Amino acid sequence: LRFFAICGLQEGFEPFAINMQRPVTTWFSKSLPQFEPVPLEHPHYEVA
Amino acid sequence: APLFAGTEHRAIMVDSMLHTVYRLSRGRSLTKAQRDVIEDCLMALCRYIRPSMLQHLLRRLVFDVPILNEFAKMPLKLLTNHYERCWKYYCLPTGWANFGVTSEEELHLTRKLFWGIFDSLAHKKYDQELYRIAMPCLCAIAGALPPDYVDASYSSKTEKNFDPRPVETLNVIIPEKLDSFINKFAEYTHEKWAFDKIQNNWSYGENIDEELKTHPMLRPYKTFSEKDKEIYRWPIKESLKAMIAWEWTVEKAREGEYNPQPPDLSVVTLSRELQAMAEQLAENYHNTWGRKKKQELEAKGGGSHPLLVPYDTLTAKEKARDREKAQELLKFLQMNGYAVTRGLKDMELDTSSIEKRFAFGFLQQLLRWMDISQEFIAHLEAVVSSGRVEKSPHEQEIKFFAKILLPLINQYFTNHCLYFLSTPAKVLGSGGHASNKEKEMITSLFCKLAALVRHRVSLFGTDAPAVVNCLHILARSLDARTVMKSGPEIVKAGLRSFFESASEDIEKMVENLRLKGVGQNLTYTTVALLPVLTTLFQHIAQHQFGDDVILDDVQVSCYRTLCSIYSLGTTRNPYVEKLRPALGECLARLAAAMPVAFLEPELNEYNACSVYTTKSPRERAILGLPNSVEEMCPDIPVLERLMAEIGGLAESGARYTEMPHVIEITLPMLCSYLPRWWERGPEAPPPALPAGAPPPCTAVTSDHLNSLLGNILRIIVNNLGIDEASWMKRLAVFAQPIVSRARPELLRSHFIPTIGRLRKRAGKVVAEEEQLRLEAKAEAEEGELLVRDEFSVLCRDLYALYPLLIRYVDNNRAHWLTEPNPNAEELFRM
């Protein structure tokens, strides 16, 4: 961390992954269209 | 009322309710309490109904309110609240959140409402109630309209309880060529109407009946009944005689043209001008149509036709049918060679989008009213000088200009300020940038208003504050860079004359202070000029317009102003003792704006903005400019000498009395000169070094700024504890901008001892407080005011020093925390 000491350390903020043995897993928004069930509360489409 | 929010699904019924309530509000035999209840209900509903759902109510109000009769009082308040609440829905391109965005029709209605109210108020006699109720409405509508909105249905002629009266067709006659045209069109009309009947699945039967779907006139136009021929031919006879009365001369220029078929007419398209012609023709058709509905109203004996609102008021939905009818008539005219008379109206309307923007028309009207202002201010001056005249033949003109335009101008240019300052390259506003013509017009407005006010504050009297505020707003909304770089010579000369007159007035004020017209000039400069000039210079400095605006004659005028204000220093009159603050602020802004290092004449050879470089030696003598830049005026010392003098005073520990000029004018001037020229001198971000950058025109370095800040702190320390030091608050604010370049040694050199002294004083006063609390009765009551005053002076010193300390901390916190600093720790302790 490059500015944790400058602002946050003395204010009492803790790094998000301070005491984790392993790097934090991440997810990303994949832009590959996929078929999923029509949501039961979809604002526009209703299936009977 | 709140439950009406989110009622889209019954917009028809909500709209009907609104119309019914409005009609009830405008009712006879209705007592005042009842009318108040109705008005309260209407306003409460409009406070919650969505903006998109009030379109029809607006369409009725645009027709009603312009009259500005007694009934117009409540609608004005309703519109004021509606627009003040929903301004985003109309102005912002994105629109209001969850409410959508306005539409062309609503914007058109808003513009018509604004201009109708404006014209009616301008032509109406003064009335306090109406003016007070109307001015906020105009401000709200103007703030709602987008500055650059262009009216799609724009008109220039703008011809003209609705009374739709079509032109008298019977009066004029029908040409025989056009009678042949009308016969052909009647055959065509029968053919298309029978084609539509085919689309309806009609049949040719000897009897007429929809249920049987039999229709006896499904026979060729040759056999089409003569009476039926006459009635299918008469509408066009009347329409074409209306056109003749309109003087739309239509002639056979080009060639002319059972089983129902529609002859194709949509193939031929009316060009914009002929589309406008067809719009006028459809308006005439609407006039006949609404006349028939009128006749129905007289038959009823009292009522109102819902769709009796004029064509322009109508949205495209109701327009569309009549527009199509007129379009078909003109299309058949074209296929028959006949073409309407466009005259010159089309290309004298064409203008351009720039001339059609709302801001453009608003500024044009403001400038015309400014021309009227010249006339009646001249008359008022003449009568006030001699020959008492109470007639005031322009009385309503004065009242309008002072009660509507000034608050309007103020609010409008306070809101749409970024629009007039944005440029295509750099857009500061949410969306849209003012055209060069608009920028020139606003500049001309500012110059004209300043000239109007010059030496005439008393004439305006109680409105002078309003005029000065308007001048401030315009100055902060003026795009001097663009106006000067590319603009009419008239506008450029206007602005240059403003600066030159300001310089002359400042010189006269200075000489008078050094010791009738004297009092007039003093009041004018101390109330309008100095504030307005300061605001203009601050605006230029903030937007970095100095390198583009303050050149040549403007630069000479700024030299004169600067040199007079500074030369005033030698004087010590009580009047000066009161005017020093304003002059110092003006000088600080001028120093921040001026593009020449007037304190470093030696290095002026490298300044590309100096008049001595822009102008030629052959020129600069046709003016009064001296041969050498040093000789512009030598009263102001050079930077080195001025810094040396300030340091000498600070070290000698003089009091505010000994150097009033230095603390009030010189120091604020440097606190703006040094930061500006540091950026452009050596020891600056070098983006231009790749090129053969010419030598810097100045020598300002971080050392100068550090020395000045140290000297200012030393001076405040010297004057620390004085009973009356009202100048400290101004000095701290003026010295704040220069702190960012302070050097680390400043902490221990100046800040630590200063705050140490201040802590010592605080401790002493606290000890006195404790002694008083130990004592009681008169002993406690007495000296209580003493300790209160001591704490007052201590708080003054604290609020004079901490504002500087905070900035120094904010810039060195990073280094202090990264590397421990015992001096920083001691400062924390203090």
Side-chain angles (χ1 to χ4, degrees), chain A, chain B residues 1-209 211-221 223-320 322-830:
Chain A
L1 294 175
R2 292 178 64 188
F3 294 103
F4 180 52
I6 304 300
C7 179
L9 173 62
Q10 317 297 342
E11 290 80 5
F13 285 89
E14 278 209 322
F16 184 80
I18 184 57
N19 284 308
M20 293 180 183
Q21 295 297 109
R22 298 177 298 279
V24 170
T25 290
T26 60
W27 291 57
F28 78 107
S29 57
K30 195 154 82 155
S31 289
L32 177 69
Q34 294 264 359
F35 279 104
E36 302 173 20
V38 178
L40 196 41
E41 68 279 16
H42 196 281
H44 305 284
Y45 305 128
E46 179 209 80
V47 174
Chain B
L3 285 180
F4 283 101
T7 57
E8 295 84 3
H9 65 279
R10 294 177 67 88
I12 301 299
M13 184 278 287
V14 168
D15 173 352
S16 178
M17 179 183 69
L18 287 165
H19 275 77
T20 306
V21 172
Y22 183 54
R23 184 176 176 87
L24 282 168
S25 84
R26 59 174 52 252
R28 45 175 75 100
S29 296
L30 185 65
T31 62
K32 183 174 174 65
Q34 295 186 326
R35 188 179 298 280
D36 292 3
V37 174
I38 301 173
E39 295 164 337
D40 293 0
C41 192
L42 194 51
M43 293 177 71
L45 296 186
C46 294
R47 184 177 296 113
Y48 296 100
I49 297 169
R50 291 166 30 96
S52 170
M53 293 177 70
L54 312 190
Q55 161 160 13
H56 297 263
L57 191 49
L58 264 64
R59 194 209 308 304
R60 182 65 60 84
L61 293 160
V62 61
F63 182 76
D64 284 7
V65 184
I67 303 159
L68 285 193
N69 61 327
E70 192 39 59
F71 284 160
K73 299 291 179 67
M74 179 267 300
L76 280 164
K77 296 179 182 178
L78 190 153
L79 297 156
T80 307
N81 302 129
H82 165 54
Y83 281 117
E84 277 185 5
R85 159 191 166 243
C86 299
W87 76 269
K88 291 185 177 68
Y89 170 84
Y90 296 101
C91 183
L92 274 50
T94 186
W96 205 5
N98 320 318
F99 295 113
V101 65
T102 185
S103 67
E104 179 62 25
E105 294 294 328
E106 314 184 55
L107 285 186
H108 173 65
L109 287 175
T110 307
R111 167 167 204 159
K112 288 182 71 67
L113 185 70
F114 176 85
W115 278 126
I117 299 164
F118 187 87
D119 304 354
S120 178
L121 204 53
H123 295 285
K124 187 180 285 293
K125 184 178 184 292
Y126 177 71
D127 165 36
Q128 182 147 6
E129 290 319 282
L130 188 55
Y131 274 46
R132 185 177 65 247
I133 289 308
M135 182 285 276
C137 200
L138 287 168
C139 295
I141 301 170
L145 288 173
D148 61 357
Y149 164 66
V150 172
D151 195 44
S153 54
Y154 162 84
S155 178
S156 287
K157 64 183 182 293
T158 72
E159 183 263 339
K160 71 185 288 184
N161 192 1
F162 192 56
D163 215 355
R165 281 87 49 91
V167 288
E168 289 79 3
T169 67
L170 189 149
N171 297 10
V172 298
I173 61 168
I174 188 68
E176 293 295 328
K177 66 182 176 66
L178 278 178
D179 283 301
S180 88
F181 167 76
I182 286 161
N183 297 308
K184 293 185 290 296
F185 187 83
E187 304 144 22
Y188 152 72
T189 298
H190 176 72
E191 289 175 353
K192 276 193 72 71
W193 157 69
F195 155 79
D196 316 320
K197 289 202 299 295
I198 292 297
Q199 291 296 112
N200 216 10
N201 296 319
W202 271 98
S203 80
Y204 178 27
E206 67 275 16
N207 60 5
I208 184 64
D209 194 68
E211 292 82 3
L212 289 186
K213 203 64 168 292
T214 49
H215 190 280
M217 295 298 102
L218 271 70
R219 71 195 192 186
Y221 210 82
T223 64
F224 188 70
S225 179
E226 311 320 287
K227 71 182 186 293
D228 287 321
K229 284 182 176 179
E230 195 278 330
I231 60 171
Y232 270 63
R233 189 171 293 119
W234 193 49
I236 305 96
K237 290 161 100 151
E238 310 156 84
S239 297
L240 199 157
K241 294 220 292 165
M243 293 177 71
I244 290 149
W246 280 129
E247 283 70 62
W248 303 350
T249 77
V250 295
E251 279 78 42
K252 183 66 168 64
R254 193 258 297 164
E255 179 267 338
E257 295 178 353
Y258 65 100
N259 195 13
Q261 71 281 16
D264 202 325
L265 277 296
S266 65
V267 68
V268 68
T269 301
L270 305 176
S271 66
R272 290 297 91 195
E273 64 185 1
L274 298 95
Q275 280 285 109
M277 295 299 291
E279 290 290 327
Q280 302 160 243
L281 202 45
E283 193 275 332
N284 186 0
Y285 298 144
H286 183 254
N287 270 22
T288 76
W289 165 99
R291 191 268 301 165
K292 292 186 284 292
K293 264 68 72 179
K294 283 194 287 185
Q295 308 330 294
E296 299 151 23
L297 310 165
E298 291 85 5
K300 291 190 287 184
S304 179
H305 169 59
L307 193 63
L308 214 60
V309 73
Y311 199 59
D312 60 357
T313 48
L314 294 174
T315 183
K317 183 264 287 180
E318 296 88 0
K319 295 172 81 95
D322 191 356
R323 188 184 302 121
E324 285 180 353
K325 161 166 44 48
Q327 278 171 304
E328 293 293 328
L329 194 148
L330 187 58
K331 288 171 185 291
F332 213 78
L333 281 163
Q334 296 183 2
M335 293 180 183
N336 291 114
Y338 303 98
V340 295
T341 309
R342 283 79 56 84
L344 73 165
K345 276 75 70 175
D346 61 301
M347 73 291 291
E348 63 89 19
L349 267 72
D350 62 11
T351 65
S352 169
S353 46
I354 304 302
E355 287 75 358
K356 294 183 199 63
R357 294 168 144 187
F358 172 63
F360 199 106
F362 185 44
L363 277 155
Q364 274 193 276
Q365 272 303 294
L366 288 180
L367 282 171
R368 172 183 83 94
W369 262 94
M370 185 64 72
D371 289 331
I372 297 165
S373 312
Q374 186 165 351
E375 290 294 328
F376 63 85
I377 195 59
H379 180 89
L380 188 153
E381 213 177 359
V383 301
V384 172
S385 79
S386 66
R388 306 286 77 73
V389 174
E390 283 61 49
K391 178 65 173 65
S392 296
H394 321 97
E395 186 44 64
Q396 63 84 30
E397 292 183 354
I398 297 89
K399 293 308 253 182
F400 191 69
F401 177 83
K403 305 297 136 173
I404 305 296
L405 293 178
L406 288 184
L408 186 61
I409 284 158
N410 182 358
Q411 188 274 331
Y412 186 82
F413 292 105
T414 302
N415 293 118
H416 311 292
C417 182
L418 299 191
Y419 165 80
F420 284 105
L421 282 177
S422 286
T423 62
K426 181 174 71 68
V427 305
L428 321 169
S430 83
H433 78 264
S435 75
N436 288 21
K437 204 138 173 216
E438 286 156 305
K439 297 182 188 269
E440 287 138 27
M441 263 187 297
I442 186 166
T443 301
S444 179
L445 189 60
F446 170 84
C447 297
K448 288 214 218 294
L449 186 53
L452 206 75
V453 177
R454 181 178 176 181
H455 292 304
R456 279 192 280 240
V457 67
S458 88
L459 281 72
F460 288 100
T462 188
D463 306 310
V467 191
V468 177
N469 281 15
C470 286
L471 280 174
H472 282 278
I473 298 319
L474 295 159
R476 271 187 297 244
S477 184
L478 202 166
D479 195 296
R481 155 170 310 161
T482 300
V483 173
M484 287 293 114
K485 186 179 289 293
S486 53
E489 176 57 40
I490 297 91
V491 184
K492 298 223 280 213
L495 188 64
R496 292 202 226 91
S497 312
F498 167 69
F499 279 114
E500 194 271 332
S501 296
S503 75
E504 289 176 322
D505 307 328
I506 295 296
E507 285 172 344
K508 287 175 70 67
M509 183 182 73
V510 161
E511 65 84 17
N512 284 316
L513 294 174
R514 189 182 301 282
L515 293 172
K516 52 184 191 297
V518 176
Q520 293 179 356
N521 189 359
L522 190 150
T523 303
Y524 160 64
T525 67
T526 192
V527 171
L529 192 44
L530 267 175
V532 168
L533 188 63
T534 298
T535 298
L536 190 43
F537 282 143
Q538 183 166 34
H539 171 72
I540 290 167
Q542 285 183 359
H543 290 67
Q544 294 82 17
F545 292 160
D547 292 331
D548 295 331
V549 185
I550 306 301
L551 282 72
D552 294 332
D553 291 331
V554 184
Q555 203 174 119
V556 184
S557 297
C558 288
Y559 291 165
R560 303 169 49 189
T561 301
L562 169 61
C563 194
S564 73
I565 293 181
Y566 186 87
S567 83
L568 183 145
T570 71
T571 302
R572 305 281 299 231
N573 290 318
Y575 292 165
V576 173
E577 293 294 329
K578 184 188 48 153
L579 288 174
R580 284 184 189 276
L583 298 151
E585 188 163 6
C586 184
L587 210 55
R589 298 314 182 245
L590 183 142
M594 174 95 70
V596 297
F598 48 94
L599 299 172
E600 279 162 281
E602 293 84 4
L603 283 71
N604 194 41
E605 292 83 3
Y606 320 118
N607 208 324
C609 297
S610 161
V611 74
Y612 278 83
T613 292
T614 66
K615 295 289 180 66
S616 66
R618 185 266 183 188
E619 292 177 352
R620 176 205 318 165
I622 297 89
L623 282 72
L625 277 296
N627 63 7
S628 178
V629 66
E630 288 78 18
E631 292 180 354
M632 278 295 321
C633 70
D635 63 356
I636 298 142
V638 299
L639 184 54
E640 291 81 3
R641 293 181 184 271
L642 192 60
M643 284 293 260
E645 295 175 355
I646 295 168
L649 272 297
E651 282 317 316
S652 89
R655 300 290 176 88
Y656 168 69
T657 73
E658 294 184 357
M659 52 196 179
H661 189 57
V662 181
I663 295 166
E664 289 291 330
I665 293 166
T666 299
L667 269 170
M669 180 194 45
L670 291 171
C671 292
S672 309
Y673 175 97
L674 292 176
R676 166 180 205 299
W677 281 117
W678 178 86
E679 304 260 2
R680 293 180 181 177
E683 188 180 1
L689 268 57
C697 64
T698 182
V700 175
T701 44
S702 291
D703 189 46
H704 292 95
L705 284 80
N706 200 58
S707 296
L708 195 76
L709 188 51
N711 287 329
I712 280 154
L713 290 174
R714 188 61 165 80
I715 292 168
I716 296 170
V717 160
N718 300 332
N719 283 258
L720 183 63
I722 302 302
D723 291 331
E724 294 295 328
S726 66
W727 51 268
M728 293 180 183
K729 69 181 146 301
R730 296 187 297 267
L731 185 48
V733 175
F734 277 130
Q736 274 174 27
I738 190 167
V739 186
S740 68
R741 298 294 296 163
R743 186 179 295 276
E745 293 83 3
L746 185 63
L747 184 55
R748 185 177 65 247
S749 77
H750 289 83
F751 266 113
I752 283 295
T754 295
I755 307 294
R757 291 184 38 132
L758 189 60
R759 179 186 67 186
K760 187 183 288 293
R761 277 183 77 247
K764 296 291 181 68
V765 185
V766 161
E768 294 294 328
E769 184 68 26
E770 302 328 288
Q771 296 299 108
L772 271 71
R773 310 280 69 65
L774 181 63
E775 306 326 317
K777 298 288 98 175
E779 293 83 3
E781 193 278 331
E782 180 62 25
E784 205 273 336
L785 294 174
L786 286 194
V787 302
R788 290 175 70 88
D789 296 341
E790 283 162 325
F791 285 116
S792 179
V793 56
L794 181 74
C795 287
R796 184 204 67 218
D797 309 344
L798 279 164
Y799 271 69
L801 289 174
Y802 284 171
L804 299 182
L805 178 53
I806 292 167
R807 313 230 176 263
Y808 184 70
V809 168
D810 274 19
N811 303 150
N812 293 257
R813 183 177 292 171
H815 178 233
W816 290 344
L817 275 172
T818 285
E819 169 172 355
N821 204 347
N823 316 290
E825 276 154 17
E826 184 65 25
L827 187 67
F828 168 66
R829 300 207 189 64
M830 272 154 206

